[PDB]
Design a protein around this nucleic acid. Structure first.
Ligand SMILES: Nc1nc2c(ncn2[C@H]2C[C@H](O)[C@@H](COP(=O)(O)OP(=O)(O)OP(=O)(O)O)O2)c(=O)[nH]1
Ligand SMILES: [Ca+2]
Ligand SMILES: [Ca+2]
Ligand SMILES: [Ca+2]
Length: 341
DNA sequence: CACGGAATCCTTCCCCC
DNA sequence: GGGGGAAGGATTC
């Protein structure tokens, strides 16, 4: 079983460079402006010129500017990156019928057939890297291993613009040497929980009673880590399908006034519906980000599909339900549609 | 100072054999 | 007791 994972380098920023080469070599910061005030918002991503100075995804735009006041700041253009991403996924498809598009810039390929060993896998990787660079002029990192997880870990190790194979010999040393926090699916919350249990390496998950592990991080997560640690994780590359579409926006000022919030909510529904394109949802959820960045939501599932009029009507009720049950002011408001017919 | 889309899994009900 | 779902939240990429 050989999996090849492809992860595009500093994607949003690299696309902006491709579309305007004069940016190359300079620090480029792709931002999401919230409109609350001068430069309010977060950084979606930045190229490596900017990252070596601390500017990276997640930090506030205002803080990025204090560090790199002369960098180039650009508004994120999601749609454009999505279309470039699509073209790249189509190139990868020609290397394997079994492909898993994990996100706007990640994909796993089951090349167990196309190749007979790791040496050949590596060469297919270079072939893929070269093809993408030539065709779209975008550099990517390739990870290759026994399964999806280590394939991803491989890429994480070799980026940017790299390629790496993690052989069965290395898998084992990683199972005993890799910081468990570096395992995909293990965020800050799960890592801390695992620390308190004395587990700092995948190998430590076998020196614990299952039920105690399950009780701490959940069964699904417990079985996941245990299979990896036992070198038995073996999930298949499957084509994922969109299950929900939605949109959430930030209001200029926090609020509790139904008539002040409605506009942002209806705007979110509008964009959500234009995106549903032919897909009809039976479920709707109104999502709110309180002033203390907490996330609360109220939704409803219907026995039939939801017409746009119904969505406008039902969303107002759900928003009223939110305000009634939660006294905090609202900062971000939006909707999400799911359970497509 | 901290935007944004979405999948999955966990708890707590709730209806009903 | 447990199958079947729905809600609201937790967690991660
Ligand atoms: N709005 C927003 N977009 C994000 C955020 N974090 C990541 N993204 C986008 C950034 C990338 O263009 C794309 C994710 O790839 P990362 O896995 O983020 O890789 P990126 O390509 O930026 O880093 P890299 O140098 O290739 O390893 O998802 C975030 O916090 N906010
Ligand atoms: Ca990337
Ligand atoms: Ca990625
Ligand atoms: Ca981590």
């Amino acid at each position: 079983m050989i999996v090849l994972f492809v992860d595009f380098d500093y994607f949003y920023a690299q696309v902006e460079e491709v579309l305007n080469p004069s940016l190359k070599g300079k620090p480029v910061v792709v931002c999401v402006f919230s409109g609350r005030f001068e430069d309010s918002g977060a950084v979606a991503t930045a190229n490596y010129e900017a990252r070596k100075f601390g500017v990276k995804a997640g930090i506030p735009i205002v803080e990025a500017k204090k560090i790199l006041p002369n960098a180039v700041y650009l508004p994120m253009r999601k749609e454009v990156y999505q279309q470039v991403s699509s073209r790249i996924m189509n190139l990868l498809r020609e290397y394997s019928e079994k492909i898993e598009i994990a996100s706007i810039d990640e994909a796993y390929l089951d090349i167990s057939d196309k190749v007979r060993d790791y040496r050949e896998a590596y060469n297919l990787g270079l072939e893929i890297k070269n093809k993408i660079l030539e065709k779209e002029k975008i550099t990517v990192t390739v990870g290759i291993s026994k399964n999806k997880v280590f394939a991803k870990i491989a890429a994480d190790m070799a980026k940017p613009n790299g390629i790496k194979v993690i052989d069965d010999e290395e898998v084992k040393r990683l199972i005993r040497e890799l910081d468990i926090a570096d395992v995909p699916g293990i965020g800050n919350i799960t890592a801390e929980k695992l620390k308190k249990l004395g587990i700092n390496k995948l190998v430590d998950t076998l020196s614990i009673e299952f039920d105690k592990l399950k009780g701490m991080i959940g069964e699904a997560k417990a079985k996941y880590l245990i299979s990896l640690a036992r070198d038995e994780y073996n999930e298949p590359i499957r084509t994922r399908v969109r299950k929900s579409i939605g949109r959430i926006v930030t209001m200029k000022r926090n609020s509790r006034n139904l008539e002040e919030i409605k506009p942002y909510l209806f705007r979110a529904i509008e964009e959500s519906y234009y995106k549903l394109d032919k897909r009809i949802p039976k479920a709707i959820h109104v999502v709110a980000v309180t002033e203390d960045l907490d996330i609360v939501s109220r939704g409803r599932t219907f026995p039939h599909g939801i017409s746009k009029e119904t969505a406008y009507s039902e969303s107002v009720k759900l928003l009223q339900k939110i305000l009634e049950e939660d006294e905090r002011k609202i900062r971000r408001i939006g909707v999400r549609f799911s359970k497509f017919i």
